[PDB]
Amino acid sequence: DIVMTQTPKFLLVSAGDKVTITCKASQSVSNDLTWYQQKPGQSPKLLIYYASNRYTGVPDRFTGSGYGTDFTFTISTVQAEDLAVYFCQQDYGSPPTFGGGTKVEIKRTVAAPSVFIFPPSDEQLKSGTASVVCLLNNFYPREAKVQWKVDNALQSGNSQESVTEQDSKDSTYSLSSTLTLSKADYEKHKVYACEVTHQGLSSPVTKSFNR
Amino acid sequence: LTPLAYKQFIPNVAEKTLGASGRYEGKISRNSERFKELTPNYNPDIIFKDEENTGADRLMTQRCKDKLNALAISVMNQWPGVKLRVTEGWDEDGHHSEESLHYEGRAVDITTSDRDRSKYGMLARLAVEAGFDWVYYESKAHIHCSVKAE
Amino acid sequence: QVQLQQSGPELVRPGVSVKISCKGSGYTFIDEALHWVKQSHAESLEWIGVIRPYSGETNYNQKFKDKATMTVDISSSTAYLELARLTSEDSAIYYCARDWERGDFFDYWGQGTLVTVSSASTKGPSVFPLAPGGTAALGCLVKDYFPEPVTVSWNSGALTSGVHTFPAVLQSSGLYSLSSVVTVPSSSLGTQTYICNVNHKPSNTKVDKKVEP
């Protein structure tokens, strides 16, 4: 079976700059090399086939070249909306086989998060649990410190974070941090605070409520 | 007759060069004065896939019709019960790369009616003998054939 | 418009088979080959096989020969992939994808079917409000469900700008939890109704939850 070695595994690039992805087959595959773009949550989208032919409606900035083992995919001037995993696929040999993919990530200017805190609903507290949620909206870069403080005591081990994929339209991330307490523990304390440290902030931002 | 090899093109020059099918003149559009140059092929021994359900794959230049009709005969002689099949002809829709001879009604992508991929090398040889100006074993799934302009 | 519509997500016990479906519309279904593609963490994209509806021909990747069966029902324009004797290595997204007679490469793809192989029972989520500068944030906490996935829309797909649905986190309970948030004009709060539309197909859970100050 033919092995497709795709490099690099990832790329960080600014809007307007060039992306060059390489795909090397373990044996010659003529020009039977296809490039796909997989945006997060979506199926792969066909961009280039027969190594260099753009699919109907694919923009000019996407090109491909090569014949035999060594293939190149280029985005001449990358756009914010081009963030995706790109894959090559050969179909010279049966079975068709795919490369491991190249993740293309967009570098943009620093953007500070907008911060929001949400207390647990009365509906959830009824059921014996308190989830406290801290939202960091539309920031760059992804690195951020989110610290919970309960009556000014810094918490550990009782929170989990999730980060969105990069936004296709402003190249930012968003992040949730959820603090999980028993109703009993929640009810022992008054002040619930989310403290956010980020490159784009002059000093840390705290959002808090009193229970 | 020897079949063409996979990815082989005859003659051994690029499609739009002087000794093959020559220069792309320009895209033919339905509304246009140049549309009248295209003539429909309703040969009952040619299968048209009609991907777009418009009958556009039947509209082709006089030379394209003449070479396609000769190939229809040689396909039936080669493999009794089998017919020439056109998957793509004249392209109103940008489904081929820029300056495709499909946009001029001067090119067809073809198979045998039974879609027996093993016949396609010999189909391509038949297309050369029928007098197509350029023949290209472009994929496992089809042979690409074109003609010179009128 | 060509469309491949796949069947919903599946929770399946190890040892058991699953059969997933792919319905084509917007083209003559019989005329194009239909391929199946697996996407896992462990092996990225893998081609499973092809069925040619027009001939009934099937070609399997040898790696899937003992695992996969491809069939078609022409009268319903539906292709099926049966996966037999499941193990955890079968947990993945499965796609159907067509070619258009230019080679074994794929212009139109189904949306994918997530198959989770597990002994654990399905559990539907609880949906709680995240109650609400010129900008306000609100949301839905979608807590304690199994397996993936869940979908979240706002105002039945009417509100897409400013929505962020977070990736699920696996809790120590072995249940998933996620939040979906949206930033709206502060002004449009007393005014406009905000409803999160939560669907967890494996548990037949549908919640259309109203989030208010």
PDB file of N, CA and C in Angstrom, chain C residues 6-78:
ATOM      1  N   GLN C   6     -26.309  11.488   5.606  1.00  0.00           N
ATOM      2  CA  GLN C   6     -26.001  10.299   6.403  1.00  0.00           C
ATOM      3  C   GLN C   6     -26.952  10.198   7.612  1.00  0.00           C
ATOM      4  N   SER C   7     -27.039   8.994   8.102  1.00  0.00           N
ATOM      5  CA  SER C   7     -27.793   8.654   9.330  1.00  0.00           C
ATOM      6  C   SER C   7     -27.043   9.220  10.552  1.00  0.00           C
ATOM      7  N   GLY C   8     -27.799   9.306  11.658  1.00  0.00           N
ATOM      8  CA  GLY C   8     -27.327   9.959  12.872  1.00  0.00           C
ATOM      9  C   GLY C   8     -26.234   9.192  13.575  1.00  0.00           C
ATOM     10  N   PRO C   9     -25.760   9.784  14.688  1.00  0.00           N
ATOM     11  CA  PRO C   9     -24.699   9.191  15.491  1.00  0.00           C
ATOM     12  C   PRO C   9     -25.185   7.893  16.141  1.00  0.00           C
ATOM     13  N   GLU C  10     -24.267   7.001  16.443  1.00  0.00           N
ATOM     14  CA  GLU C  10     -24.600   5.632  16.928  1.00  0.00           C
ATOM     15  C   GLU C  10     -23.752   5.339  18.160  1.00  0.00           C
ATOM     16  N   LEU C  11     -24.379   4.839  19.198  1.00  0.00           N
ATOM     17  CA  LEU C  11     -23.675   4.213  20.311  1.00  0.00           C
ATOM     18  C   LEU C  11     -23.844   2.718  20.113  1.00  0.00           C
ATOM     19  N   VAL C  12     -22.760   1.981  20.099  1.00  0.00           N
ATOM     20  CA  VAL C  12     -22.835   0.521  19.872  1.00  0.00           C
ATOM     21  C   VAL C  12     -21.944  -0.237  20.856  1.00  0.00           C
ATOM     22  N   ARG C  13     -22.466  -1.352  21.390  1.00  0.00           N
ATOM     23  CA  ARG C  13     -21.701  -2.201  22.331  1.00  0.00           C
ATOM     24  C   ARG C  13     -20.632  -2.936  21.529  1.00  0.00           C
ATOM     25  N   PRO C  14     -19.478  -3.219  22.138  1.00  0.00           N
ATOM     26  CA  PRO C  14     -18.462  -4.057  21.516  1.00  0.00           C
ATOM     27  C   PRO C  14     -19.051  -5.434  21.172  1.00  0.00           C
ATOM     28  N   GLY C  15     -18.652  -6.024  20.046  1.00  0.00           N
ATOM     29  CA  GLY C  15     -19.110  -7.350  19.584  1.00  0.00           C
ATOM     30  C   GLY C  15     -20.311  -7.245  18.651  1.00  0.00           C
ATOM     31  N   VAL C  16     -21.055  -6.160  18.732  1.00  0.00           N
ATOM     32  CA  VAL C  16     -22.337  -5.944  18.012  1.00  0.00           C
ATOM     33  C   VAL C  16     -22.007  -5.329  16.638  1.00  0.00           C
ATOM     34  N   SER C  17     -22.891  -5.441  15.650  1.00  0.00           N
ATOM     35  CA  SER C  17     -22.724  -4.757  14.357  1.00  0.00           C
ATOM     36  C   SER C  17     -23.507  -3.435  14.345  1.00  0.00           C
ATOM     37  N   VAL C  18     -23.180  -2.548  13.412  1.00  0.00           N
ATOM     38  CA  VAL C  18     -23.957  -1.313  13.166  1.00  0.00           C
ATOM     39  C   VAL C  18     -24.060  -1.144  11.654  1.00  0.00           C
ATOM     40  N   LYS C  19     -25.168  -0.587  11.196  1.00  0.00           N
ATOM     41  CA  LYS C  19     -25.375  -0.335   9.760  1.00  0.00           C
ATOM     42  C   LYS C  19     -25.733   1.126   9.622  1.00  0.00           C
ATOM     43  N   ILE C  20     -24.960   1.846   8.845  1.00  0.00           N
ATOM     44  CA  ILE C  20     -25.157   3.302   8.693  1.00  0.00           C
ATOM     45  C   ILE C  20     -25.498   3.602   7.239  1.00  0.00           C
ATOM     46  N   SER C  21     -26.210   4.691   6.982  1.00  0.00           N
ATOM     47  CA  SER C  21     -26.852   4.916   5.670  1.00  0.00           C
ATOM     48  C   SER C  21     -26.398   6.266   5.123  1.00  0.00           C
ATOM     49  N   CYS C  22     -26.495   6.361   3.813  1.00  0.00           N
ATOM     50  CA  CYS C  22     -26.082   7.515   2.994  1.00  0.00           C
ATOM     51  C   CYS C  22     -27.006   7.679   1.817  1.00  0.00           C
ATOM     52  N   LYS C  23     -27.841   8.705   1.844  1.00  0.00           N
ATOM     53  CA  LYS C  23     -28.883   8.903   0.821  1.00  0.00           C
ATOM     54  C   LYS C  23     -28.422  10.027  -0.101  1.00  0.00           C
ATOM     55  N   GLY C  24     -28.431   9.752  -1.380  1.00  0.00           N
ATOM     56  CA  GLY C  24     -28.013  10.740  -2.382  1.00  0.00           C
ATOM     57  C   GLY C  24     -29.215  11.382  -3.014  1.00  0.00           C
ATOM     58  N   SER C  25     -29.115  12.664  -3.280  1.00  0.00           N
ATOM     59  CA  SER C  25     -30.121  13.412  -4.022  1.00  0.00           C
ATOM     60  C   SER C  25     -29.415  14.417  -4.913  1.00  0.00           C
ATOM     61  N   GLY C  26     -30.133  14.937  -5.912  1.00  0.00           N
ATOM     62  CA  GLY C  26     -29.608  16.057  -6.713  1.00  0.00           C
ATOM     63  C   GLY C  26     -28.770  15.578  -7.897  1.00  0.00           C
ATOM     64  N   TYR C  27     -28.788  14.282  -8.162  1.00  0.00           N
ATOM     65  CA  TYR C  27     -28.074  13.624  -9.277  1.00  0.00           C
ATOM     66  C   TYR C  27     -28.699  12.246  -9.432  1.00  0.00           C
ATOM     67  N   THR C  28     -28.448  11.589 -10.557  1.00  0.00           N
ATOM     68  CA  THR C  28     -28.924  10.206 -10.775  1.00  0.00           C
ATOM     69  C   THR C  28     -28.056   9.290  -9.931  1.00  0.00           C
ATOM     70  N   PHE C  29     -28.584   8.838  -8.794  1.00  0.00           N
ATOM     71  CA  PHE C  29     -27.871   8.056  -7.751  1.00  0.00           C
ATOM     72  C   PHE C  29     -27.152   6.833  -8.345  1.00  0.00           C
ATOM     73  N   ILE C  30     -27.833   6.101  -9.224  1.00  0.00           N
ATOM     74  CA  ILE C  30     -27.297   4.823  -9.796  1.00  0.00           C
ATOM     75  C   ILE C  30     -25.994   5.046 -10.579  1.00  0.00           C
ATOM     76  N   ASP C  31     -25.826   6.215 -11.172  1.00  0.00           N
ATOM     77  CA  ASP C  31     -24.758   6.534 -12.150  1.00  0.00           C
ATOM     78  C   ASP C  31     -23.387   6.784 -11.502  1.00  0.00           C
ATOM     79  N   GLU C  32     -23.262   7.099 -10.199  1.00  0.00           N
ATOM     80  CA  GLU C  32     -21.932   7.434  -9.641  1.00  0.00           C
ATOM     81  C   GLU C  32     -21.544   6.409  -8.596  1.00  0.00           C
ATOM     82  N   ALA C  33     -20.242   6.140  -8.501  1.00  0.00           N
ATOM     83  CA  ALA C  33     -19.682   5.294  -7.443  1.00  0.00           C
ATOM     84  C   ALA C  33     -19.786   6.050  -6.123  1.00  0.00           C
ATOM     85  N   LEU C  34     -20.010   5.297  -5.063  1.00  0.00           N
ATOM     86  CA  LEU C  34     -20.108   5.820  -3.687  1.00  0.00           C
ATOM     87  C   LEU C  34     -19.019   5.158  -2.863  1.00  0.00           C
ATOM     88  N   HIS C  35     -18.179   5.978  -2.250  1.00  0.00           N
ATOM     89  CA  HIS C  35     -17.063   5.524  -1.413  1.00  0.00           C
ATOM     90  C   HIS C  35     -17.326   5.767   0.074  1.00  0.00           C
ATOM     91  N   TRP C  36     -16.673   4.993   0.932  1.00  0.00           N
ATOM     92  CA  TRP C  36     -16.729   5.187   2.392  1.00  0.00           C
ATOM     93  C   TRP C  36     -15.350   5.442   2.919  1.00  0.00           C
ATOM     94  N   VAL C  37     -15.240   6.386   3.843  1.00  0.00           N
ATOM     95  CA  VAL C  37     -13.981   6.919   4.389  1.00  0.00           C
ATOM     96  C   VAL C  37     -14.117   6.996   5.901  1.00  0.00           C
ATOM     97  N   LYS C  38     -13.161   6.448   6.604  1.00  0.00           N
ATOM     98  CA  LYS C  38     -13.108   6.495   8.080  1.00  0.00           C
ATOM     99  C   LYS C  38     -12.173   7.626   8.506  1.00  0.00           C
ATOM    100  N   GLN C  39     -12.581   8.359   9.553  1.00  0.00           N
ATOM    101  CA  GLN C  39     -11.701   9.388  10.133  1.00  0.00           C
ATOM    102  C   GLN C  39     -11.633   9.106  11.625  1.00  0.00           C
ATOM    103  N   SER C  40     -10.478   8.669  12.083  1.00  0.00           N
ATOM    104  CA  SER C  40     -10.271   8.469  13.543  1.00  0.00           C
ATOM    105  C   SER C  40      -9.184   9.428  14.024  1.00  0.00           C
ATOM    106  N   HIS C  41      -8.988   9.556  15.338  1.00  0.00           N
ATOM    107  CA  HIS C  41      -7.718  10.163  15.867  1.00  0.00           C
ATOM    108  C   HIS C  41      -6.485   9.364  15.380  1.00  0.00           C
ATOM    109  N   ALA C  42      -6.481   8.038  15.644  1.00  0.00           N
ATOM    110  CA  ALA C  42      -5.341   7.083  15.501  1.00  0.00           C
ATOM    111  C   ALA C  42      -4.815   6.976  14.052  1.00  0.00           C
ATOM    112  N   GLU C  43      -5.671   7.044  13.011  1.00  0.00           N
ATOM    113  CA  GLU C  43      -5.273   6.735  11.593  1.00  0.00           C
ATOM    114  C   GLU C  43      -5.685   7.836  10.552  1.00  0.00           C
ATOM    115  N   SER C  44      -6.095   9.076  10.965  1.00  0.00           N
ATOM    116  CA  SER C  44      -6.611  10.227  10.147  1.00  0.00           C
ATOM    117  C   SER C  44      -7.609   9.632   9.124  1.00  0.00           C
ATOM    118  N   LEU C  45      -7.425   9.908   7.819  1.00  0.00           N
ATOM    119  CA  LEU C  45      -8.429   9.509   6.793  1.00  0.00           C
ATOM    120  C   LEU C  45      -8.030   8.161   6.154  1.00  0.00           C
ATOM    121  N   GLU C  46      -8.967   7.233   6.085  1.00  0.00           N
ATOM    122  CA  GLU C  46      -8.706   5.902   5.520  1.00  0.00           C
ATOM    123  C   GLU C  46      -9.853   5.568   4.576  1.00  0.00           C
ATOM    124  N   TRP C  47      -9.525   5.143   3.359  1.00  0.00           N
ATOM    125  CA  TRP C  47     -10.559   4.690   2.410  1.00  0.00           C
ATOM    126  C   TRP C  47     -10.993   3.256   2.730  1.00  0.00           C
ATOM    127  N   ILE C  48     -12.276   3.030   2.901  1.00  0.00           N
ATOM    128  CA  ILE C  48     -12.794   1.679   3.265  1.00  0.00           C
ATOM    129  C   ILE C  48     -13.120   0.897   2.002  1.00  0.00           C
ATOM    130  N   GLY C  49     -13.778   1.546   1.063  1.00  0.00           N
ATOM    131  CA  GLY C  49     -14.236   0.829  -0.135  1.00  0.00           C
ATOM    132  C   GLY C  49     -15.122   1.666  -1.006  1.00  0.00           C
ATOM    133  N   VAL C  50     -15.551   1.057  -2.109  1.00  0.00           N
ATOM    134  CA  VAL C  50     -16.447   1.681  -3.099  1.00  0.00           C
ATOM    135  C   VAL C  50     -17.506   0.693  -3.544  1.00  0.00           C
ATOM    136  N   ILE C  51     -18.702   1.200  -3.761  1.00  0.00           N
ATOM    137  CA  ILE C  51     -19.758   0.445  -4.438  1.00  0.00           C
ATOM    138  C   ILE C  51     -20.149   1.242  -5.680  1.00  0.00           C
ATOM    139  N   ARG C  52     -20.340   0.510  -6.750  1.00  0.00           N
ATOM    140  CA  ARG C  52     -20.811   1.036  -8.052  1.00  0.00           C
ATOM    141  C   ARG C  52     -22.251   0.574  -8.225  1.00  0.00           C
ATOM    142  N   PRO C  53     -23.240   1.434  -7.940  1.00  0.00           N
ATOM    143  CA  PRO C  53     -24.630   1.023  -7.937  1.00  0.00           C
ATOM    144  C   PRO C  53     -25.060   0.460  -9.293  1.00  0.00           C
ATOM    145  N   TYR C  54     -24.490   0.991 -10.361  1.00  0.00           N
ATOM    146  CA  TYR C  54     -24.905   0.706 -11.762  1.00  0.00           C
ATOM    147  C   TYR C  54     -24.552  -0.739 -12.117  1.00  0.00           C
ATOM    148  N   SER C  55     -23.514  -1.325 -11.495  1.00  0.00           N
ATOM    149  CA  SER C  55     -23.046  -2.716 -11.765  1.00  0.00           C
ATOM    150  C   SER C  55     -23.212  -3.623 -10.535  1.00  0.00           C
ATOM    151  N   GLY C  56     -23.388  -3.110  -9.315  1.00  0.00           N
ATOM    152  CA  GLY C  56     -23.330  -3.863  -8.041  1.00  0.00           C
ATOM    153  C   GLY C  56     -21.897  -4.254  -7.678  1.00  0.00           C
ATOM    154  N   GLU C  57     -20.911  -3.816  -8.439  1.00  0.00           N
ATOM    155  CA  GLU C  57     -19.492  -4.061  -8.118  1.00  0.00           C
ATOM    156  C   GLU C  57     -19.129  -3.415  -6.765  1.00  0.00           C
ATOM    157  N   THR C  58     -18.349  -4.108  -5.936  1.00  0.00           N
ATOM    158  CA  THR C  58     -17.770  -3.575  -4.688  1.00  0.00           C
ATOM    159  C   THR C  58     -16.272  -3.820  -4.712  1.00  0.00           C
ATOM    160  N   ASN C  59     -15.502  -2.889  -4.185  1.00  0.00           N
ATOM    161  CA  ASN C  59     -14.039  -3.058  -4.012  1.00  0.00           C
ATOM    162  C   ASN C  59     -13.759  -2.616  -2.579  1.00  0.00           C
ATOM    163  N   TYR C  60     -13.182  -3.507  -1.775  1.00  0.00           N
ATOM    164  CA  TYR C  60     -12.892  -3.218  -0.365  1.00  0.00           C
ATOM    165  C   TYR C  60     -11.393  -3.029  -0.215  1.00  0.00           C
ATOM    166  N   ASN C  61     -10.999  -2.030   0.562  1.00  0.00           N
ATOM    167  CA  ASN C  61      -9.668  -2.018   1.204  1.00  0.00           C
ATOM    168  C   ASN C  61      -9.452  -3.327   1.978  1.00  0.00           C
ATOM    169  N   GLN C  62      -8.345  -4.031   1.714  1.00  0.00           N
ATOM    170  CA  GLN C  62      -8.118  -5.335   2.382  1.00  0.00           C
ATOM    171  C   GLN C  62      -8.168  -5.154   3.894  1.00  0.00           C
ATOM    172  N   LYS C  63      -7.769  -3.996   4.436  1.00  0.00           N
ATOM    173  CA  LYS C  63      -7.749  -3.728   5.895  1.00  0.00           C
ATOM    174  C   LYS C  63      -9.176  -3.816   6.469  1.00  0.00           C
ATOM    175  N   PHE C  64     -10.212  -3.662   5.647  1.00  0.00           N
ATOM    176  CA  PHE C  64     -11.639  -3.601   6.081  1.00  0.00           C
ATOM    177  C   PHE C  64     -12.412  -4.825   5.595  1.00  0.00           C
ATOM    178  N   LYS C  65     -11.762  -5.754   4.902  1.00  0.00           N
ATOM    179  CA  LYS C  65     -12.490  -6.861   4.255  1.00  0.00           C
ATOM    180  C   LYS C  65     -13.315  -7.656   5.287  1.00  0.00           C
ATOM    181  N   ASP C  66     -12.806  -7.869   6.497  1.00  0.00           N
ATOM    182  CA  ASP C  66     -13.540  -8.686   7.511  1.00  0.00           C
ATOM    183  C   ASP C  66     -14.489  -7.826   8.362  1.00  0.00           C
ATOM    184  N   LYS C  67     -14.549  -6.546   8.139  1.00  0.00           N
ATOM    185  CA  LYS C  67     -15.190  -5.569   9.051  1.00  0.00           C
ATOM    186  C   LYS C  67     -16.406  -5.000   8.329  1.00  0.00           C
ATOM    187  N   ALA C  68     -16.212  -4.588   7.075  1.00  0.00           N
ATOM    188  CA  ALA C  68     -17.194  -3.766   6.349  1.00  0.00           C
ATOM    189  C   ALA C  68     -17.981  -4.577   5.314  1.00  0.00           C
ATOM    190  N   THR C  69     -19.250  -4.238   5.168  1.00  0.00           N
ATOM    191  CA  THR C  69     -20.098  -4.679   4.035  1.00  0.00           C
ATOM    192  C   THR C  69     -20.807  -3.465   3.433  1.00  0.00           C
ATOM    193  N   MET C  70     -20.663  -3.249   2.125  1.00  0.00           N
ATOM    194  CA  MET C  70     -21.351  -2.152   1.389  1.00  0.00           C
ATOM    195  C   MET C  70     -22.512  -2.730   0.585  1.00  0.00           C
ATOM    196  N   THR C  71     -23.684  -2.120   0.727  1.00  0.00           N
ATOM    197  CA  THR C  71     -24.875  -2.485  -0.047  1.00  0.00           C
ATOM    198  C   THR C  71     -25.513  -1.205  -0.551  1.00  0.00           C
ATOM    199  N   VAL C  72     -26.476  -1.343  -1.448  1.00  0.00           N
ATOM    200  CA  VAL C  72     -27.245  -0.154  -1.895  1.00  0.00           C
ATOM    201  C   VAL C  72     -28.693  -0.585  -2.069  1.00  0.00           C
ATOM    202  N   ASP C  73     -29.620   0.321  -1.788  1.00  0.00           N
ATOM    203  CA  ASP C  73     -31.025   0.186  -2.220  1.00  0.00           C
ATOM    204  C   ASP C  73     -31.277   1.251  -3.293  1.00  0.00           C
ATOM    205  N   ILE C  74     -31.386   0.858  -4.551  1.00  0.00           N
ATOM    206  CA  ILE C  74     -31.518   1.816  -5.668  1.00  0.00           C
ATOM    207  C   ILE C  74     -32.849   2.547  -5.497  1.00  0.00           C
ATOM    208  N   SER C  75     -33.892   1.849  -5.079  1.00  0.00           N
ATOM    209  CA  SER C  75     -35.242   2.455  -5.074  1.00  0.00           C
ATOM    210  C   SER C  75     -35.321   3.586  -4.028  1.00  0.00           C
ATOM    211  N   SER C  76     -34.492   3.615  -2.985  1.00  0.00           N
ATOM    212  CA  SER C  76     -34.458   4.724  -1.993  1.00  0.00           C
ATOM    213  C   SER C  76     -33.204   5.596  -2.165  1.00  0.00           C
ATOM    214  N   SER C  77     -32.419   5.401  -3.215  1.00  0.00           N
ATOM    215  CA  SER C  77     -31.163   6.160  -3.442  1.00  0.00           C
ATOM    216  C   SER C  77     -30.302   6.160  -2.175  1.00  0.00           C
ATOM    217  N   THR C  78     -30.147   4.999  -1.532  1.00  0.00           N
ATOM    218  CA  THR C  78     -29.455   4.909  -0.231  1.00  0.00           C
ATOM    219  C   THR C  78     -28.396   3.817  -0.280  1.00  0.00           C
TER     220      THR C  78
END
